[PDB]
Amino acid sequence: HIEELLRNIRTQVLIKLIKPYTRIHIPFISKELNIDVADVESLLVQCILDNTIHGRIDQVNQLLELDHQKRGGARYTALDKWTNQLNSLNQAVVSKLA
Amino acid sequence: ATTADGSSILDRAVIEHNLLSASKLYNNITFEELGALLEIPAAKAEKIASQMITEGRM
Amino acid sequence: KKNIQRLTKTFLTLSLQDMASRVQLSGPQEAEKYVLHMIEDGEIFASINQKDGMVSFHDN
Amino acid sequence: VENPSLDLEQYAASYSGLMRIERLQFIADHCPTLRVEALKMALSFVQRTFNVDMYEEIHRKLSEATALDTAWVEATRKKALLKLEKLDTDLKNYKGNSIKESIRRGHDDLGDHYLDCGDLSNALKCYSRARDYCTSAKHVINMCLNVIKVSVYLQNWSHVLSYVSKAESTPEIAEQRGERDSQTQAILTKLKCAAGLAELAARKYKQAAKCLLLASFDHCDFPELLSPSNVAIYGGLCALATFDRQELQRNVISSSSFKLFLELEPQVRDIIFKFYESKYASCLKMLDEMKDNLLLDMYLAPHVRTLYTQIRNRALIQYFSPYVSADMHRMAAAFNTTVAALEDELTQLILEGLISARVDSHSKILYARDVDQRSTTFEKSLLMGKEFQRRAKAMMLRAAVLRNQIHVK
């Protein structure tokens, strides 16, 4: 069970470390966690796939971009719904009976 | 006493206070200017700034 | 033109020879001419870099 | 084929029917100097009760590929018909004098001698006649099991599914608590395995894996409907093909009953673990190696190849889930393919909307695409308004022409 450990603690440290950043170098994370870059990339991929870290990885520049975005634009989504509804209703008036 | 890296408790406390006070007069700052404002240019200015965040203090 | 637009729906930066092969236009110069005509007409949003014979899509 | 011949227990009790004959013949029709009596062993030396007529046909074929019993065939076939007449007489005497136990036995062993002597239609009609033998819920379970077992041979799955549903729903939802698994044997496992087999045969993989996964390992004492290794093959491959990450983690990874099944074959367990833990090159290599042995069995042949493609597609999506800008060289290297083939696959995937990305064929980089919500909303609302205005201006003319009553006389 020592393999399950030394991974939960690393995950918690990573989560508490990448919290305030928005675009953070991966070599910096590797230096902080005292592991090689491949392990850092694998851990980040596993965490993102598990919905524990909200961010993406820029592989070309070796960067991690966080999710300080997606503001309260849900209003637009609501409008979208209305749009399609209206479309259907239009047909229901243009082919109701004649 | 010294908090590990040869820094007195008063020095660390006043550095944290200076960072907190400068957070009220700056929209955004650079690491070099933040270090020039309160010494410790970049080795631990970013570290202190990130430590103040994730704790509700900034 | 429809095939070229569908190409823009997927790619971001494409070689002229690659575009000619995909749209079966049989020639990079002919593909460049078609893209230039469509850009002039406004049906497409693209730019041509002749240094590498490349076409980029700026859909904003 | 690099490391073959590591399978011996299969030849003992793999399957039952002509399907094993066809599949084993297909192996040796290709491999050098293998179509011989050694191959013919598992085909024809398994000849059993009434295996004389299809013996005649595929034995004429083997003869042509690689004598004709008519003395022993006449003797034992007409011996079997003699028992047909004489048994039929005995069971019909039990029918006439109305010994319910003996009449139901008549049904059962007559179906037995029908699968023992070629008859299948009258066997199915007797399985339906089992209705007359209305003892209790136990007899209902018994006849449902028999009809499922025979309809598996009969190449029908709609009736199999209907019988499975009616058997699961008739005794008040599997006797509610199950009557402590009836007689300390859970009949639920048999019905669940049969339902999963039928559902996968019906080109419905996800529904098959939903019910096939929950099967008790200790209650698989019927090695004639579906072998446990085949059960693990199905519940691994189909579940990997259909289930998403959370479903795979919940119903497979954390499930304890399926673990023993995964112990039957390390290959499926390794495939699942490698797919789960972001290891795709080795997973694809092992799948390619296992593809031949998987296609060996035809009960999964109309299902395997397509499923493989699906799995690959899923892998692709996963590889781009945590990345905002991926390098296609590493992607191609990790997917055991060249850059051009990966580019074509990604273009095909993007064209159908599975993955939102853009290919840059200058540095060969796959960038992520973010949709602008406000701009898209405005554009689609304007399009809807234009369409509505056009429809209105058409309908007004339609109404005007209806008022005048214009038509060609």
Side-chain angles (χ1 to χ4, degrees), chain C residues 10-11 22, chain D residues 316-317 319-320 326 328 331-332 335 339-355 357-359 365-366:
Chain C
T10 297
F11 283 79
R22 303 179 86 91
Chain D
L316 266 299
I317 299 161
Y319 201 94
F320 208 66
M328 261 185 324
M331 216 161 148
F335 268 105
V339 200
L342 179 86
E343 213 167 282
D344 300 336
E345 267 189 305
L346 286 166
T347 286
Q348 207 43 62
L349 274 192
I350 291 159
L351 270 185
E352 65 206 25
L354 254 297
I355 168 183
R358 294 289 182 261
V359 189
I365 291 169
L366 191 57

PDB file of all heavy atoms in Angstrom, chain C residues 10-11 22, chain D residues 316-317 319-320 326 328 331-332 335 339-355 357-359 365-366:
ATOM      1  N   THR C  10     -11.660  22.263 -40.699  1.00  0.00           N
ATOM      2  CA  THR C  10     -10.812  21.339 -39.953  1.00  0.00           C
ATOM      3  C   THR C  10      -9.390  21.841 -39.753  1.00  0.00           C
ATOM      4  O   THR C  10      -8.849  21.716 -38.651  1.00  0.00           O
ATOM      5  CB  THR C  10     -10.770  19.978 -40.662  1.00  0.00           C
ATOM      6  OG1 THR C  10     -12.082  19.404 -40.675  1.00  0.00           O
ATOM      7  CG2 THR C  10      -9.822  19.029 -39.951  1.00  0.00           C
ATOM      8  N   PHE C  11      -8.771  22.416 -40.777  1.00  0.00           N
ATOM      9  CA  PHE C  11      -7.371  22.805 -40.728  1.00  0.00           C
ATOM     10  C   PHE C  11      -7.218  24.263 -40.308  1.00  0.00           C
ATOM     11  O   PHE C  11      -8.153  25.062 -40.378  1.00  0.00           O
ATOM     12  CB  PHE C  11      -6.702  22.588 -42.087  1.00  0.00           C
ATOM     13  CG  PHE C  11      -6.378  21.153 -42.381  1.00  0.00           C
ATOM     14  CD1 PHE C  11      -7.362  20.282 -42.808  1.00  0.00           C
ATOM     15  CD2 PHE C  11      -5.088  20.679 -42.234  1.00  0.00           C
ATOM     16  CE1 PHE C  11      -7.065  18.962 -43.082  1.00  0.00           C
ATOM     17  CE2 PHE C  11      -4.786  19.360 -42.506  1.00  0.00           C
ATOM     18  CZ  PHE C  11      -5.777  18.501 -42.930  1.00  0.00           C
ATOM     19  N   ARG C  22      -6.078  17.364 -51.689  1.00  0.00           N
ATOM     20  CA  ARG C  22      -7.324  17.039 -50.999  1.00  0.00           C
ATOM     21  C   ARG C  22      -8.547  17.446 -51.815  1.00  0.00           C
ATOM     22  O   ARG C  22      -9.504  16.672 -51.932  1.00  0.00           O
ATOM     23  CB  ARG C  22      -7.358  17.696 -49.618  1.00  0.00           C
ATOM     24  CG  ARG C  22      -6.188  17.325 -48.724  1.00  0.00           C
ATOM     25  CD  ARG C  22      -6.266  18.036 -47.385  1.00  0.00           C
ATOM     26  NE  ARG C  22      -7.077  17.302 -46.421  1.00  0.00           N
ATOM     27  CZ  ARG C  22      -6.598  16.405 -45.570  1.00  0.00           C
ATOM     28  NH1 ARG C  22      -5.310  16.105 -45.535  1.00  0.00           N
ATOM     29  NH2 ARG C  22      -7.432  15.793 -44.735  1.00  0.00           N
TER      30      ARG C  22
ATOM     31  N   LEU D 316      -8.186   8.196 -28.839  1.00  0.00           N
ATOM     32  CA  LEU D 316      -7.837   9.483 -29.426  1.00  0.00           C
ATOM     33  C   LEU D 316      -8.407  10.618 -28.590  1.00  0.00           C
ATOM     34  O   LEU D 316      -7.673  11.509 -28.146  1.00  0.00           O
ATOM     35  CB  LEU D 316      -8.354   9.562 -30.865  1.00  0.00           C
ATOM     36  CG  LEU D 316      -7.410   9.178 -32.007  1.00  0.00           C
ATOM     37  CD1 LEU D 316      -6.198  10.087 -32.034  1.00  0.00           C
ATOM     38  CD2 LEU D 316      -6.989   7.723 -31.911  1.00  0.00           C
ATOM     39  N   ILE D 317      -9.707  10.546 -28.290  1.00  0.00           N
ATOM     40  CA  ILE D 317     -10.349  11.617 -27.537  1.00  0.00           C
ATOM     41  C   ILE D 317      -9.658  11.794 -26.196  1.00  0.00           C
ATOM     42  O   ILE D 317      -9.316  12.915 -25.794  1.00  0.00           O
ATOM     43  CB  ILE D 317     -11.851  11.330 -27.369  1.00  0.00           C
ATOM     44  CG1 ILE D 317     -12.528  11.236 -28.737  1.00  0.00           C
ATOM     45  CG2 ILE D 317     -12.506  12.405 -26.520  1.00  0.00           C
ATOM     46  CD1 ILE D 317     -13.857  10.522 -28.707  1.00  0.00           C
ATOM     47  N   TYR D 319      -6.628  11.125 -25.379  1.00  0.00           N
ATOM     48  CA  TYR D 319      -5.306  11.712 -25.533  1.00  0.00           C
ATOM     49  C   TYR D 319      -5.372  13.223 -25.680  1.00  0.00           C
ATOM     50  O   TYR D 319      -4.396  13.908 -25.357  1.00  0.00           O
ATOM     51  CB  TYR D 319      -4.583  11.099 -26.733  1.00  0.00           C
ATOM     52  CG  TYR D 319      -3.082  11.255 -26.671  1.00  0.00           C
ATOM     53  CD1 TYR D 319      -2.284  10.260 -26.128  1.00  0.00           C
ATOM     54  CD2 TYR D 319      -2.462  12.401 -27.148  1.00  0.00           C
ATOM     55  CE1 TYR D 319      -0.913  10.400 -26.065  1.00  0.00           C
ATOM     56  CE2 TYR D 319      -1.093  12.551 -27.089  1.00  0.00           C
ATOM     57  CZ  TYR D 319      -0.322  11.549 -26.548  1.00  0.00           C
ATOM     58  OH  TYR D 319       1.043  11.696 -26.490  1.00  0.00           O
ATOM     59  N   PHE D 320      -6.496  13.763 -26.143  1.00  0.00           N
ATOM     60  CA  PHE D 320      -6.632  15.203 -26.282  1.00  0.00           C
ATOM     61  C   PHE D 320      -7.464  15.828 -25.173  1.00  0.00           C
ATOM     62  O   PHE D 320      -7.712  17.037 -25.213  1.00  0.00           O
ATOM     63  CB  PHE D 320      -7.237  15.552 -27.643  1.00  0.00           C
ATOM     64  CG  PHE D 320      -6.817  16.894 -28.159  1.00  0.00           C
ATOM     65  CD1 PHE D 320      -5.498  17.138 -28.491  1.00  0.00           C
ATOM     66  CD2 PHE D 320      -7.738  17.916 -28.303  1.00  0.00           C
ATOM     67  CE1 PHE D 320      -5.105  18.370 -28.962  1.00  0.00           C
ATOM     68  CE2 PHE D 320      -7.351  19.151 -28.774  1.00  0.00           C
ATOM     69  CZ  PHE D 320      -6.032  19.379 -29.104  1.00  0.00           C
ATOM     70  N   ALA D 326      -1.180  19.980 -28.508  1.00  0.00           N
ATOM     71  CA  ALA D 326      -0.445  18.727 -28.544  1.00  0.00           C
ATOM     72  C   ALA D 326       0.464  18.670 -29.765  1.00  0.00           C
ATOM     73  O   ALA D 326       0.169  19.250 -30.813  1.00  0.00           O
ATOM     74  CB  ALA D 326      -1.403  17.535 -28.555  1.00  0.00           C
ATOM     75  N   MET D 328       1.875  16.497 -32.695  1.00  0.00           N
ATOM     76  CA  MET D 328       1.373  15.316 -33.389  1.00  0.00           C
ATOM     77  C   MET D 328       2.448  14.262 -33.614  1.00  0.00           C
ATOM     78  O   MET D 328       2.108  13.100 -33.856  1.00  0.00           O
ATOM     79  CB  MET D 328       0.739  15.707 -34.724  1.00  0.00           C
ATOM     80  CG  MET D 328      -0.779  15.806 -34.661  1.00  0.00           C
ATOM     81  SD  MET D 328      -1.570  16.121 -36.249  1.00  0.00           S
ATOM     82  CE  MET D 328      -0.384  17.211 -37.017  1.00  0.00           C
ATOM     83  N   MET D 331       2.138  12.143 -30.575  1.00  0.00           N
ATOM     84  CA  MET D 331       0.860  11.446 -30.683  1.00  0.00           C
ATOM     85  C   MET D 331       0.966  10.257 -31.632  1.00  0.00           C
ATOM     86  O   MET D 331       0.509   9.151 -31.319  1.00  0.00           O
ATOM     87  CB  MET D 331      -0.217  12.422 -31.156  1.00  0.00           C
ATOM     88  CG  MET D 331      -1.588  12.202 -30.553  1.00  0.00           C
ATOM     89  SD  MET D 331      -2.623  13.671 -30.703  1.00  0.00           S
ATOM     90  CE  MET D 331      -4.244  12.935 -30.875  1.00  0.00           C
ATOM     91  N   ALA D 332       1.578  10.470 -32.799  1.00  0.00           N
ATOM     92  CA  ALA D 332       1.747   9.388 -33.761  1.00  0.00           C
ATOM     93  C   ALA D 332       2.657   8.298 -33.211  1.00  0.00           C
ATOM     94  O   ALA D 332       2.397   7.105 -33.408  1.00  0.00           O
ATOM     95  CB  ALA D 332       2.299   9.938 -35.075  1.00  0.00           C
ATOM     96  N   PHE D 335       0.685   6.287 -30.739  1.00  0.00           N
ATOM     97  CA  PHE D 335      -0.427   5.547 -31.317  1.00  0.00           C
ATOM     98  C   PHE D 335       0.011   4.539 -32.372  1.00  0.00           C
ATOM     99  O   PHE D 335      -0.838   4.013 -33.098  1.00  0.00           O
ATOM    100  CB  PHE D 335      -1.457   6.512 -31.905  1.00  0.00           C
ATOM    101  CG  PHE D 335      -2.540   6.893 -30.942  1.00  0.00           C
ATOM    102  CD1 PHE D 335      -2.548   8.140 -30.342  1.00  0.00           C
ATOM    103  CD2 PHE D 335      -3.547   5.999 -30.627  1.00  0.00           C
ATOM    104  CE1 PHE D 335      -3.542   8.489 -29.452  1.00  0.00           C
ATOM    105  CE2 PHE D 335      -4.543   6.342 -29.736  1.00  0.00           C
ATOM    106  CZ  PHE D 335      -4.542   7.588 -29.149  1.00  0.00           C
ATOM    107  N   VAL D 339       2.680  10.174 -39.053  1.00  0.00           N
ATOM    108  CA  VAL D 339       2.069  11.487 -38.875  1.00  0.00           C
ATOM    109  C   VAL D 339       0.908  11.680 -39.843  1.00  0.00           C
ATOM    110  O   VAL D 339      -0.120  12.266 -39.487  1.00  0.00           O
ATOM    111  CB  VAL D 339       3.125  12.594 -39.029  1.00  0.00           C
ATOM    112  CG1 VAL D 339       2.634  13.881 -38.389  1.00  0.00           C
ATOM    113  CG2 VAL D 339       4.444  12.157 -38.416  1.00  0.00           C
ATOM    114  N   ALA D 340       1.054  11.209 -41.085  1.00  0.00           N
ATOM    115  CA  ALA D 340       0.010  11.419 -42.086  1.00  0.00           C
ATOM    116  C   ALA D 340      -1.264  10.654 -41.743  1.00  0.00           C
ATOM    117  O   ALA D 340      -2.372  11.189 -41.879  1.00  0.00           O
ATOM    118  CB  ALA D 340       0.522  11.016 -43.467  1.00  0.00           C
ATOM    119  N   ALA D 341      -1.131   9.398 -41.311  1.00  0.00           N
ATOM    120  CA  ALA D 341      -2.309   8.619 -40.943  1.00  0.00           C
ATOM    121  C   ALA D 341      -3.014   9.226 -39.738  1.00  0.00           C
ATOM    122  O   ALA D 341      -4.249   9.282 -39.693  1.00  0.00           O
ATOM    123  CB  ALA D 341      -1.915   7.169 -40.666  1.00  0.00           C
ATOM    124  N   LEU D 342      -2.243   9.684 -38.750  1.00  0.00           N
ATOM    125  CA  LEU D 342      -2.837  10.352 -37.598  1.00  0.00           C
ATOM    126  C   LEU D 342      -3.535  11.640 -38.014  1.00  0.00           C
ATOM    127  O   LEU D 342      -4.601  11.975 -37.486  1.00  0.00           O
ATOM    128  CB  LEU D 342      -1.767  10.634 -36.546  1.00  0.00           C
ATOM    129  CG  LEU D 342      -2.245  11.355 -35.286  1.00  0.00           C
ATOM    130  CD1 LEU D 342      -2.782  10.357 -34.277  1.00  0.00           C
ATOM    131  CD2 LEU D 342      -1.117  12.171 -34.689  1.00  0.00           C
ATOM    132  N   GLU D 343      -2.944  12.377 -38.955  1.00  0.00           N
ATOM    133  CA  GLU D 343      -3.575  13.592 -39.460  1.00  0.00           C
ATOM    134  C   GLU D 343      -4.908  13.282 -40.125  1.00  0.00           C
ATOM    135  O   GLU D 343      -5.902  13.980 -39.898  1.00  0.00           O
ATOM    136  CB  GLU D 343      -2.638  14.293 -40.441  1.00  0.00           C
ATOM    137  CG  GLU D 343      -2.741  15.805 -40.447  1.00  0.00           C
ATOM    138  CD  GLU D 343      -1.598  16.458 -41.198  1.00  0.00           C
ATOM    139  OE1 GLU D 343      -0.491  16.557 -40.629  1.00  0.00           O
ATOM    140  OE2 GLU D 343      -1.805  16.868 -42.359  1.00  0.00           O
ATOM    141  N   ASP D 344      -4.946  12.235 -40.952  1.00  0.00           N
ATOM    142  CA  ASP D 344      -6.197  11.852 -41.602  1.00  0.00           C
ATOM    143  C   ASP D 344      -7.242  11.421 -40.579  1.00  0.00           C
ATOM    144  O   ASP D 344      -8.419  11.792 -40.685  1.00  0.00           O
ATOM    145  CB  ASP D 344      -5.944  10.736 -42.615  1.00  0.00           C
ATOM    146  CG  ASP D 344      -4.977  11.148 -43.706  1.00  0.00           C
ATOM    147  OD1 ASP D 344      -4.848  12.364 -43.960  1.00  0.00           O
ATOM    148  OD2 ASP D 344      -4.346  10.256 -44.312  1.00  0.00           O
ATOM    149  N   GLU D 345      -6.830  10.636 -39.579  1.00  0.00           N
ATOM    150  CA  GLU D 345      -7.765  10.196 -38.547  1.00  0.00           C
ATOM    151  C   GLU D 345      -8.318  11.380 -37.763  1.00  0.00           C
ATOM    152  O   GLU D 345      -9.522  11.442 -37.484  1.00  0.00           O
ATOM    153  CB  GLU D 345      -7.079   9.208 -37.607  1.00  0.00           C
ATOM    154  CG  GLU D 345      -7.251   7.753 -37.995  1.00  0.00           C
ATOM    155  CD  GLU D 345      -6.740   6.804 -36.930  1.00  0.00           C
ATOM    156  OE1 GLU D 345      -5.562   6.929 -36.537  1.00  0.00           O
ATOM    157  OE2 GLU D 345      -7.517   5.934 -36.483  1.00  0.00           O
ATOM    158  N   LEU D 346      -7.454  12.329 -37.402  1.00  0.00           N
ATOM    159  CA  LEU D 346      -7.904  13.505 -36.668  1.00  0.00           C
ATOM    160  C   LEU D 346      -8.832  14.364 -37.513  1.00  0.00           C
ATOM    161  O   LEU D 346      -9.813  14.912 -37.000  1.00  0.00           O
ATOM    162  CB  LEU D 346      -6.701  14.318 -36.194  1.00  0.00           C
ATOM    163  CG  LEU D 346      -5.922  13.714 -35.028  1.00  0.00           C
ATOM    164  CD1 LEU D 346      -4.579  14.405 -34.870  1.00  0.00           C
ATOM    165  CD2 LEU D 346      -6.733  13.805 -33.748  1.00  0.00           C
ATOM    166  N   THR D 347      -8.538  14.503 -38.808  1.00  0.00           N
ATOM    167  CA  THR D 347      -9.425  15.258 -39.688  1.00  0.00           C
ATOM    168  C   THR D 347     -10.796  14.602 -39.772  1.00  0.00           C
ATOM    169  O   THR D 347     -11.827  15.284 -39.696  1.00  0.00           O
ATOM    170  CB  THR D 347      -8.799  15.384 -41.077  1.00  0.00           C
ATOM    171  OG1 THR D 347      -7.723  16.330 -41.033  1.00  0.00           O
ATOM    172  CG2 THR D 347      -9.830  15.848 -42.091  1.00  0.00           C
ATOM    173  N   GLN D 348     -10.829  13.274 -39.906  1.00  0.00           N
ATOM    174  CA  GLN D 348     -12.104  12.568 -39.948  1.00  0.00           C
ATOM    175  C   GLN D 348     -12.870  12.733 -38.640  1.00  0.00           C
ATOM    176  O   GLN D 348     -14.092  12.918 -38.648  1.00  0.00           O
ATOM    177  CB  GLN D 348     -11.874  11.088 -40.251  1.00  0.00           C
ATOM    178  CG  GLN D 348     -13.042  10.412 -40.947  1.00  0.00           C
ATOM    179  CD  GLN D 348     -13.631  11.264 -42.051  1.00  0.00           C
ATOM    180  OE1 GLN D 348     -12.956  11.591 -43.027  1.00  0.00           O
ATOM    181  NE2 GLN D 348     -14.900  11.630 -41.903  1.00  0.00           N
ATOM    182  N   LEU D 349     -12.167  12.664 -37.507  1.00  0.00           N
ATOM    183  CA  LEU D 349     -12.828  12.822 -36.215  1.00  0.00           C
ATOM    184  C   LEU D 349     -13.375  14.234 -36.036  1.00  0.00           C
ATOM    185  O   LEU D 349     -14.480  14.415 -35.511  1.00  0.00           O
ATOM    186  CB  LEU D 349     -11.857  12.477 -35.086  1.00  0.00           C
ATOM    187  CG  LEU D 349     -11.757  11.008 -34.676  1.00  0.00           C
ATOM    188  CD1 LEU D 349     -10.983  10.876 -33.377  1.00  0.00           C
ATOM    189  CD2 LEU D 349     -13.137  10.393 -34.543  1.00  0.00           C
ATOM    190  N   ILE D 350     -12.614  15.246 -36.454  1.00  0.00           N
ATOM    191  CA  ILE D 350     -13.053  16.628 -36.296  1.00  0.00           C
ATOM    192  C   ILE D 350     -14.237  16.924 -37.208  1.00  0.00           C
ATOM    193  O   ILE D 350     -15.162  17.653 -36.829  1.00  0.00           O
ATOM    194  CB  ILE D 350     -11.878  17.591 -36.555  1.00  0.00           C
ATOM    195  CG1 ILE D 350     -10.843  17.482 -35.438  1.00  0.00           C
ATOM    196  CG2 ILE D 350     -12.366  19.025 -36.669  1.00  0.00           C
ATOM    197  CD1 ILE D 350      -9.471  17.971 -35.835  1.00  0.00           C
ATOM    198  N   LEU D 351     -14.233  16.360 -38.421  1.00  0.00           N
ATOM    199  CA  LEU D 351     -15.308  16.640 -39.367  1.00  0.00           C
ATOM    200  C   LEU D 351     -16.666  16.191 -38.839  1.00  0.00           C
ATOM    201  O   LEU D 351     -17.691  16.786 -39.188  1.00  0.00           O
ATOM    202  CB  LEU D 351     -15.015  15.970 -40.708  1.00  0.00           C
ATOM    203  CG  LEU D 351     -14.221  16.805 -41.711  1.00  0.00           C
ATOM    204  CD1 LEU D 351     -14.108  16.083 -43.042  1.00  0.00           C
ATOM    205  CD2 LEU D 351     -14.866  18.168 -41.890  1.00  0.00           C
ATOM    206  N   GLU D 352     -16.699  15.154 -38.003  1.00  0.00           N
ATOM    207  CA  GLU D 352     -17.945  14.655 -37.439  1.00  0.00           C
ATOM    208  C   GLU D 352     -18.228  15.208 -36.048  1.00  0.00           C
ATOM    209  O   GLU D 352     -19.206  14.798 -35.417  1.00  0.00           O
ATOM    210  CB  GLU D 352     -17.937  13.125 -37.406  1.00  0.00           C
ATOM    211  CG  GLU D 352     -16.895  12.517 -36.490  1.00  0.00           C
ATOM    212  CD  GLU D 352     -16.480  11.129 -36.931  1.00  0.00           C
ATOM    213  OE1 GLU D 352     -16.612  10.822 -38.135  1.00  0.00           O
ATOM    214  OE2 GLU D 352     -16.024  10.342 -36.076  1.00  0.00           O
ATOM    215  N   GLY D 353     -17.399  16.126 -35.557  1.00  0.00           N
ATOM    216  CA  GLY D 353     -17.669  16.804 -34.306  1.00  0.00           C
ATOM    217  C   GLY D 353     -17.307  16.042 -33.052  1.00  0.00           C
ATOM    218  O   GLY D 353     -17.639  16.502 -31.954  1.00  0.00           O
ATOM    219  N   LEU D 354     -16.643  14.890 -33.175  1.00  0.00           N
ATOM    220  CA  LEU D 354     -16.278  14.120 -31.989  1.00  0.00           C
ATOM    221  C   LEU D 354     -15.287  14.880 -31.114  1.00  0.00           C
ATOM    222  O   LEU D 354     -15.421  14.897 -29.885  1.00  0.00           O
ATOM    223  CB  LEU D 354     -15.701  12.767 -32.402  1.00  0.00           C
ATOM    224  CG  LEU D 354     -16.598  11.544 -32.203  1.00  0.00           C
ATOM    225  CD1 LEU D 354     -16.905  11.341 -30.730  1.00  0.00           C
ATOM    226  CD2 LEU D 354     -17.879  11.683 -33.005  1.00  0.00           C
ATOM    227  N   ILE D 355     -14.289  15.511 -31.727  1.00  0.00           N
ATOM    228  CA  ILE D 355     -13.243  16.229 -31.007  1.00  0.00           C
ATOM    229  C   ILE D 355     -13.125  17.628 -31.594  1.00  0.00           C
ATOM    230  O   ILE D 355     -13.071  17.792 -32.818  1.00  0.00           O
ATOM    231  CB  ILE D 355     -11.895  15.486 -31.078  1.00  0.00           C
ATOM    232  CG1 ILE D 355     -10.756  16.375 -30.578  1.00  0.00           C
ATOM    233  CG2 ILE D 355     -11.619  15.001 -32.489  1.00  0.00           C
ATOM    234  CD1 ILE D 355      -9.395  15.731 -30.694  1.00  0.00           C
ATOM    235  N   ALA D 357     -10.904  20.444 -32.327  1.00  0.00           N
ATOM    236  CA  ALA D 357      -9.485  20.748 -32.455  1.00  0.00           C
ATOM    237  C   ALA D 357      -9.211  21.219 -33.874  1.00  0.00           C
ATOM    238  O   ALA D 357     -10.037  21.061 -34.776  1.00  0.00           O
ATOM    239  CB  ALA D 357      -8.621  19.535 -32.103  1.00  0.00           C
ATOM    240  N   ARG D 358      -8.034  21.809 -34.060  1.00  0.00           N
ATOM    241  CA  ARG D 358      -7.584  22.289 -35.357  1.00  0.00           C
ATOM    242  C   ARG D 358      -6.162  21.811 -35.610  1.00  0.00           C
ATOM    243  O   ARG D 358      -5.310  21.873 -34.720  1.00  0.00           O
ATOM    244  CB  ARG D 358      -7.649  23.817 -35.437  1.00  0.00           C
ATOM    245  CG  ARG D 358      -9.059  24.379 -35.384  1.00  0.00           C
ATOM    246  CD  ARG D 358      -9.822  24.077 -36.662  1.00  0.00           C
ATOM    247  NE  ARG D 358     -11.166  24.643 -36.646  1.00  0.00           N
ATOM    248  CZ  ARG D 358     -12.264  23.956 -36.361  1.00  0.00           C
ATOM    249  NH1 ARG D 358     -12.217  22.667 -36.069  1.00  0.00           N
ATOM    250  NH2 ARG D 358     -13.439  24.578 -36.371  1.00  0.00           N
ATOM    251  N   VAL D 359      -5.907  21.343 -36.827  1.00  0.00           N
ATOM    252  CA  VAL D 359      -4.614  20.785 -37.202  1.00  0.00           C
ATOM    253  C   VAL D 359      -3.789  21.869 -37.877  1.00  0.00           C
ATOM    254  O   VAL D 359      -4.272  22.552 -38.787  1.00  0.00           O
ATOM    255  CB  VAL D 359      -4.779  19.568 -38.129  1.00  0.00           C
ATOM    256  CG1 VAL D 359      -3.448  18.867 -38.323  1.00  0.00           C
ATOM    257  CG2 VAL D 359      -5.815  18.611 -37.569  1.00  0.00           C
ATOM    258  N   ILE D 365       1.018  20.486 -35.340  1.00  0.00           N
ATOM    259  CA  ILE D 365       0.547  20.702 -33.975  1.00  0.00           C
ATOM    260  C   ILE D 365      -0.976  20.699 -33.965  1.00  0.00           C
ATOM    261  O   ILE D 365      -1.609  21.351 -34.801  1.00  0.00           O
ATOM    262  CB  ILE D 365       1.090  22.019 -33.389  1.00  0.00           C
ATOM    263  CG1 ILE D 365       2.595  21.912 -33.151  1.00  0.00           C
ATOM    264  CG2 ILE D 365       0.383  22.361 -32.090  1.00  0.00           C
ATOM    265  CD1 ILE D 365       3.255  23.232 -32.830  1.00  0.00           C
ATOM    266  N   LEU D 366      -1.563  19.970 -33.021  1.00  0.00           N
ATOM    267  CA  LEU D 366      -3.010  19.933 -32.847  1.00  0.00           C
ATOM    268  C   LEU D 366      -3.388  20.922 -31.750  1.00  0.00           C
ATOM    269  O   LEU D 366      -3.096  20.693 -30.571  1.00  0.00           O
ATOM    270  CB  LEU D 366      -3.479  18.521 -32.504  1.00  0.00           C
ATOM    271  CG  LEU D 366      -4.987  18.283 -32.560  1.00  0.00           C
ATOM    272  CD1 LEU D 366      -5.528  18.631 -33.932  1.00  0.00           C
ATOM    273  CD2 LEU D 366      -5.313  16.847 -32.203  1.00  0.00           C
TER     274      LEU D 366
END
